[PDB]
Amino acid sequence: DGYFEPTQELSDETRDMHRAIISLREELEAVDLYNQRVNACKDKELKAILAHNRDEEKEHAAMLLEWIRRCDPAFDKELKDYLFTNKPIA
Template sequence: MPTDQYHEPPEELSAETRTFARMCASLAEEAEAIGWYEQRISVEPNEVSRAIMLDSLKEEYKHFSMELEFLFRAKPLWAEIARGVLFQDGDIVANGGAAEEGAGSGRAPDGAGTSDAPGTLGIGSLKGQGL
């Protein structure tokens, strides 16, 4: 079955690239579902229905996060830049600029935490911090 997720002939793409494209598409779909649930929840008057949708929304957050982590592990440079932006205090745009500027240099962006394992965001280091 053909899809619109490829911008190059699929038969010319490696299996790794096709998997990466599928995960990008899944991530976009999860983000879209999160937006839909947020809208539905904001207007739903029935308390039980709203509670069910909130439970579903948490599942979407989980799926989005797992897919994002998969992509970060597949693309270490992306993960490196994300470490300089995600879970950081201060100006988001400034953090993004600093992270991009320092990417690939081998030095951590200012304020970036250390990673627990290669290819992860080091979120494990936040355990027990009440976040």
């Protein structure tokens, strides 16, 4: 999954980017999923574990994001333009 072109036609660099990105996407999905489960959960202990797991995947996502940012000038530009501001995003 994620490979839309045969791997052997892709450079190792493109494949590492693929790895980081699909990993980031999966981390984000896990944030989303844990978060819905927290909201729907009844059992307090389970709810805490889910909110906990959820918040670690945020660290995972950030780490992958930063690795992407060091390898990708066009992305680094965009993260500079929007991240850590207070102005309207729109």
